[PDB]
Design an enzyme around this catalytic site. Sequence first.
Site, short mmCIF file in Angstrom:
data_model
loop_
_atom_site.label_atom_id
_atom_site.label_comp_id
_atom_site.label_asym_id
_atom_site.label_seq_id
_atom_site.Cartn_x
_atom_site.Cartn_y
_atom_site.Cartn_z
CD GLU A 135 -3.68 -1.60 2.93
OE1 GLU A 135 -3.94 -0.83 3.88
OE2 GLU A 135 -3.99 -1.31 1.75
CG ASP A 136 -2.51 2.73 6.16
OD1 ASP A 136 -2.65 2.21 5.04
OD2 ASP A 136 -2.98 3.86 6.46
CE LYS A 150 -6.06 5.77 9.09
NZ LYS A 150 -5.14 5.17 10.13
CE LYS A 164 -5.84 -1.43 -1.39
NZ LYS A 164 -4.66 -0.70 -0.81
CB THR A 184 -0.41 10.33 1.57
OG1 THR A 184 0.12 9.01 1.48
CG2 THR A 184 0.45 11.37 0.85
CB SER A 239 -1.53 2.65 -4.03
OG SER A 239 -2.11 3.87 -3.65
CB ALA A 240 -7.27 2.36 -3.51
CG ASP A 249 -1.93 1.10 1.26
OD1 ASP A 249 -2.64 1.34 0.27
OD2 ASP A 249 -1.98 1.75 2.33
CG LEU A 250 2.13 5.44 -1.93
CD1 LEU A 250 2.18 5.83 -3.40
CD2 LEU A 250 1.85 6.63 -1.15
CG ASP A 251 -2.22 7.11 0.00
OD1 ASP A 251 -1.31 7.90 -0.34
OD2 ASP A 251 -3.14 6.77 -0.76
O1 LIG Z 1 -8.28 9.74 -4.53
P1 LIG Z 1 -7.21 8.80 -4.89
O2 LIG Z 1 -5.91 9.54 -4.87
O3 LIG Z 1 -7.43 8.05 -6.18
O4 LIG Z 1 -7.12 7.72 -3.63
C1 LIG Z 1 -8.16 6.76 -3.37
C2 LIG Z 1 -7.87 6.11 -2.03
O5 LIG Z 1 -6.51 5.52 -2.12
C3 LIG Z 1 -5.67 5.67 -0.91
O6 LIG Z 1 -4.81 4.64 -0.97
C4 LIG Z 1 -6.29 5.93 0.50
O7 LIG Z 1 -6.01 4.86 1.43
C5 LIG Z 1 -7.73 6.36 0.48
O8 LIG Z 1 -7.97 7.27 1.64
C6 LIG Z 1 -8.00 7.06 -0.85
O9 LIG Z 1 -9.29 7.56 -0.90
MG LIG Z 2 -3.26 3.01 3.24
#
Ligand SMILES: O=P(O)(O)OC[C@H]1O[C@H](O)[C@H](O)[C@@H](O)[C@@H]1O
Ligand SMILES: [Mg+2]
EC number: 5.4.2.6
Lengths: 221, 220
Positions: A169-170, A45, A145, A16, A114-115, A8-10
């Site tokens: 993952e967080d 999240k 997810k 982020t 990452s989503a 995962d990224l954020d």
């Molecule tokens: O809005 P985006 O940049 O496409 O991100 C979509 C989603 O992906 C991330 O990984 C976060 O965990 C979510 O809080 C976020 O809404």
């Molecule tokens: Mg995350």
Amino acid sequence: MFKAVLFDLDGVITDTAEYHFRAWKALAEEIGINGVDRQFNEQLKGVSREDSLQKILDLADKKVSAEEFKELAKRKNDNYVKMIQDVSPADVYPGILQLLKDLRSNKIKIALASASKNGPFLLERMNLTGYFDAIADPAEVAASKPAPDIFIAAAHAVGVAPSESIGLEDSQAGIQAIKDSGALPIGVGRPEDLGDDIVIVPDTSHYTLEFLKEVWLQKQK
Amino acid sequence: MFKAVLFDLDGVITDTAEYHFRAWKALAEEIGINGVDRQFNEQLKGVSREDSLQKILDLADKKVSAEEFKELAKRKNDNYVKMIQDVSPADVYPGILQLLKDLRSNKIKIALASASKNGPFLLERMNLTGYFDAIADPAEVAASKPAPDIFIAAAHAVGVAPSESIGLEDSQAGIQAIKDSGALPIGVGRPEDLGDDIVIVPDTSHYTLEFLKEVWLQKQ
Ligand SMILES: O=P(O)(O)OC[C@H]1O[C@H](O)[C@H](O)[C@@H](O)[C@@H]1O
Ligand SMILES: [Mg+2]
Ligand SMILES: O=P(O)(O)OC[C@H]1O[C@H](O)[C@H](O)[C@@H](O)[C@@H]1O
Ligand SMILES: [Mg+2]
Ligand SMILES: [Mg+2]
Ligand SMILES: [Mg+2]
């Protein structure tokens, strides 16, 4: 031994998740919805852009036209993108850069799961693009997810089955997606939030190649 | 960041703890003491020659003259020295050479904190002498491990405070000695023997520069 690590990224690579929270908070209050606090953010999240808005809307039972829905989603993103302009290599969470170097050094595949559609911009701004063998494109994956789709896609994009993969993952939704994909989740955060049934680390400094190997092995049993 | 690494030798740098154990076991049986097994040897790891003999005697409640006591210690050492004549660079444990290189590359002091008077001979046979900034001379410190004296001397010998040093040890007594010196111990062996309260690795391949750094950063 596991053959890939799905990141995962954020909230894993960088801080982020905080900015997504801020930006979503700001969107809710703008349309009069007041209950997007930190405790509720735990449900957002890992959740995709459109699905996150729908959770927020459902909180107030608010209903909008398809056009306004699109407009709100764009407005939150325009805001979030403005929030993330300072992100640089200095903001990479601890352990992550070493982990990527060690994974690449040991010929273990590295994929982003990452989503976020802003994922690639952030990896480049953090000067991490070179480490990633593949990025799962959220534009391509059918379901947000806790659906496993993104983690399945990331594993496949590096030629590996999910059962031969670790997911980092967080989020509650992301951890469920890892489990349901067949990959081995290792969470980063509070056990209170992500569950003490899986391996949880307090912070990313615990994510090391050797820690991943210990986890993996202990799993195999 | 930590400024020195204080190496034990036997069982850390090479598999010579096994050689000491064999030798002590063969000596004990010669004077009729049969209980020097692996489990009892955990009490001998890190312990000076004369103290190890006294422990063996105390196991059987045996008393000997001062002359025979010297004679037995010399007998064990003559046998031990024979055993180690074949030691070579091939016998360095995995990870140890790369670690020494990386420490010297990162300008981190390397000191020997071996209670073994045969320590310099083994370093030369393994062709590791060049890596050691200092060797604490066990003859100069009377107190055997678990007393911290040897580690204090090793750290001071390279200009570094023990609290700014990591100690690598395979033994209960040495881990106690590191602890009381103020240095940070990372053991190699079974957690059953060395305690799950400190960082323990199963073998020396886990001893890498970055692992020492992660461990030390994880302070408090
Ligand atoms: O809005 P985006 O940049 O496409 O991100 C979509 C989603 O992906 C991330 O990984 C976060 O965990 C979510 O809080 C976020 O809404
Ligand atoms: Mg995350
Ligand atoms: O007899 P020496 O070679 O002087 O060895 C003295 C001691 O040093 C080593 O480090 C071992 O841990 C001990 O088993 C040994 O008794
Ligand atoms: Mg209309
Ligand atoms: Mg030893
Ligand atoms: Mg020199």
